[PDB]
Symmetry: D2
């Protein structure tokens, strides 16, 4: 696929690297406001390509106009999410960038899927789509999903390949494990000794721990988000807990549920979950709506 | 995954090769009735492994008892399907083998998924599960699905990665394209100039053409079926038009629909298709039931 | 790489399959004299491609004229001794007249047997740079055997088989290393190894047969090493000048976007010796085979 | 392979990431002095693994004692001239006392700078077979540059950079080949190439910096070539005897389950020459650096 990267920070680069080396991206244009960053990153990529035999086309640019004719545009531009900053405050910071980008990118990229990575990620997507009018998904809880899976694996001392299931609903600390999806060696999770609350708060707390010690989350989200790009690029039909647009009284919101991801997206599979999880998902919609609507009002004091 | 192969014919070997070289299989036991075939195939595999650095464990055997402790058992043992032989006649040939195998394998392989490849494939699976009592899926119409996709790609002169969708229902000539799933560059299929009947009969006729000229179908089905094994082994959650057991008045039948395939299978996604395709799927169930029930009666003159 | 395949039977299909799913081949043209076989093989490839997201352009053809513009041409066209040389050298001489002017600058890789001898014939008549698969397969057979014998991973065995092809090949024991360590430090019945190499193909052939998966994958890896410019040392048979004629003998050779050098000079003295015996013996047998061909007469 | 990683910063994390998702590393132990960094890095790896189905065992540790039983040890522990040698040679001398008795039979791969010099120090004191990443990165920089300059795929450029590390490295022009053909047949400003190699890291470092993706991937490929026994020729710096001391100079070298031979003997005369200048110059500078270290005094 031809993929455009808006943001060449830590997560931008990890995502780009990982999707380029897997083959999911044959052609990429990489954009940032920082002068000469895209260019130097491109040199890095080209050196990495030599040892692998990768002939993919790559352009690092400081000119937004060079991002045109893309199939997918991955947006990771924005201030990071450190503990002590509320969702509301980050929203106020970062929505500006999305509103700006909504005015420029759609012009140069006709049928492009927009993939949001910048936080607060599902809210960033809802805003970007509100103003861009382009189809926009959020990476959502696919990362959370893989965190849950690896944790259950280490705890039971089994390979991760024996764990199935999804985290969904709202992003980050508001995420919920969809327990009706979770299976261990193919069997209901209730047959095993696992403490659900422990799993749930590992998932919610680990990104904060990682940021505290290292300064940022990269290898995990960047591979996981690159695997989303790959399932689109290769039309793999992987079910992923990304967040897709839904109409709700009657604004557009994004919430995560297991969704079929291929050359086309989706459908989402919320209708196939048990009662408890459909309930948690409904609740997530109500709460997202409330919070997002409020933040939208606040922001709209973009005075005079 | 630890995978057992019952049948080391042309399709057995292609499936085994393809799943071993992808990494989906770390451990395999390969079984056939033909003396020394498994053994010589194992030598071949080991030579192939040297150049790739593959350390997977492989055992070619003529003793059925060596196939134990497997996660997945792939059954491709049986006489092939040549034009001029009815489904009924092949059923009568091949059900015998499945009934035999249903009596031996479950004993040595506790929690194993059984994957049917031998034809008539969905009927072979229904019989194998009837008598083995083990969870059994059929490769179903996943091959048909990939045939449809590549045909639409060549006809429109686009990459296959821009085509999404599934074939389902009954196997082979009775398959139906699920048109509500089919999208080209993400858009409804009705927006493009494609002749649906042409696509449908390419899918139905091409395996016969290939068998006529070459004597058998291998590279296509064997990679496609190896990708099913891979989505189980790596817990990828690829949606695939395999055939899973359903209870119908109230015998167990297998029919294909898009199904989530991971470490756990599924659910199937028939409830999310449009009306026309849900109808075609219901019809497929009625017809399979009728035909399978009749063939079961016939076979049951296993006299005295 | 753009790769043309001459011969779409068992070994040609395997190599073409393996090289396409590894991503080493961007574009292929596949040719056979059997009517509609390449067409149907192309169909099988396209169905396999759909599941992997592979978008390489592939063309099955019954018209040799359609094989043009390639980077590498792989020749596996063959008929089922010495007679064997004559029978198949005619195929090569006919291809030698056709391929070069349609494939400016292409490299040729010989697979059809007798492989070293057929590479030599084809380069004489075509005048194009031609390599033979040589003893790379045997090399991998040797490594596979040692590793199974010592219950270790095949990734802990290093080494090459070289010289002549097939039952005349020699194990180059100064290259063989277990866990990074000289072979003489270990429990290795050399005769048992060398013997497994010579006999295992005949055994596979008898039961199956012949051989597809092993040499298909191994030879596809030569194509990969060329196409990705990996510089893998492999014991292919490259062309060498000897007594005014061009011959093919297998030795460890750097295989990249450029092919060479050979590494015979870096071997120990006994191995350098067996390789000279091999060049001499191959020359004699090649000229004796050329003679019996020159009986190409007009009744 | 079982691979231990000493240093889990920017370059150590990258190499460890790349080697694990390539499947070259079955098992890793990762160590750093920064408290809780390896633990958190291990968490990040596990989340990445879940999406790919990778099941390699990985351990982040703040206890060096936990790095035992490895096949390969990769050292990227470093402090941010000549002073640079002294500062980091202390790290190496301390590791030299600890690692060998816990890692019987392991191979060591030096990444921390000055890389050739640090490999040499560490093998003197540890007495273990030690290689340096050397000029493999530069080699890939050279290929990347030519190919972008001539608008061709990087897979059509072959060649190596060798001798000393970094700004003292030399392009080995007799190895450089475009489309399988001698470099002198093409439009190549050599000074422009050599100059791009020396200056591009400093430029990446200034803007970013420093360098992760490029050398991370390139060095992970050395690990891969060892672990899968691929026999890729790479210009790493292997140990050579010179004036009773052990030194590291980069040359094209076969890298497999066993490491070697070097290929300097197969170069042209000018390149053989620059490599001898390089061994001499590296010796002098290494002994001058050893001297200033031996001022390890007790106030
Ligand atoms: N799982 C996830 O969804 C996930 C994971 C990691 C990071 N993130 C989020 O992604 C964002 C980036 O994280 P990071 O580590 O890369 O931060 P970073 O500070 O490294 O990089 C952000 C980059 O964005 C650029 N930028 C800022 N405004 C821009 C604009 N208008 N146009 C183009 N570029 C612009 C900056 O120049 C910088 O290089 C944050 O919001 C973070 O919380 C999300
Ligand atoms: N898409 C698909 O589902 C697909 C594709 C190709 C082939 N097939 C089917 O798979 C079956 C095999 O096709 P093939 O090309 O490999 O045929 P084949 O004749 O090459 O091989 C079948 C093998 O099964 C073995 N066998 C027979 N009975 C056995 C028993 N009781 N136990 C163990 N082994 C036994 C034989 O010894 C033989 O080696 C056929 O029924 C064919 O129609 C299905
Ligand atoms: N290690 C090796 O190098 C190795 C391994 C296996 C086979 N081989 C050799 O390769 C050859 C092919 O083996 P196979 O197993 O594929 O046998 P095969 O008989 O299945 O294949 C031969 C194919 O070549 C085609 N062919 C014959 N003459 C031709 C011509 N003039 N032009 C185009 N196509 C032509 C035939 O139609 C047939 O499809 C044999 O000579 C075999 O000995 C070499
Ligand atoms: N091509 C190459 O060979 C190449 C490329 C890049 C970097 N490097 C070199 O590698 C080194 C690391 O670079 P970086 O970018 O990762 O820097 P960095 O500062 O991010 O990483 C250094 C890490 O090593 C750890 N460390 C320091 N002393 C240690 C000790 N005694 N034991 C264990 N860990 C220790 C530090 O805590 C830190 O995490 C530098 O010397 C750099 O010059 C070499």
């Amino acid at each position: 696929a031809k993929v455009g990267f808006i943001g060449a920070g830590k997560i931008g680069q990890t995502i780009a690297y990982s999707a380029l080396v897997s083959g999911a991206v044959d052609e990429a244009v990489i954009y940032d406001i920082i002068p000469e960053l895209p260019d130097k990153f491109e040199h890095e990529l080209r050196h990495a390509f030599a040892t692998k035999g990768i002939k993919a086309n790559v352009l690092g640019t400081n000119s937004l106009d060079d991002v045109s004719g893309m199939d997918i545009v991955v947006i990771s531009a924005g201030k990071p999410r450190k503990p002590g900053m509320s969702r509301r405050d980050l929203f106020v910071d970062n929505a500006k960038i999305m509103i700006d980008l909504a005015q420029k990118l759609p012009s140069k990229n006709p049928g492009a899927i927009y993939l949001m990575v910048a936080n607060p990620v599902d809210m960033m997507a809802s805003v970007f789509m509100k103003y861009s009018k382009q189809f926009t998904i959020s990476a959502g809880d696919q990362v959370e999903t893989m965190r849950m899976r690896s944790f259950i694996a280490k705890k039971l001392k089994i390979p991760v390949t024996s764990v199935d299931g999804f985290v969904g609903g709202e992003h980050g600390e508001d995420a919920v494990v969809l327990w009706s999806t979770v299976k261990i060696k193919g069997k209901p999770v209730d047959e095993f000794n696992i403490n659900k609350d422990e799993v749930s708060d590992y998932v919610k707390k680990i990104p904060g721990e990682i940021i505290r010690v290292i300064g940022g989350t990269t290898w995990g989200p960047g591979t996981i988000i690159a695997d989303i790009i790959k399932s689109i690029a290769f039309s793999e039909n992987r079910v992923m807990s990304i967040a897709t647009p839904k109409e709700y009284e009657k604004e557009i919101i994004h919430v995560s549920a297991p969704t079929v991801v291929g050359s086309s997206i989706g459908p989402s599979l919320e209708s196939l979950l048990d009662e408890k999880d459909r309930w948690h998902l409904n609740s997530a919609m109500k709460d997202f709506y409330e919070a997002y609507k409020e933040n939208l009002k606040q922001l709209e004091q973009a005075t005079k």
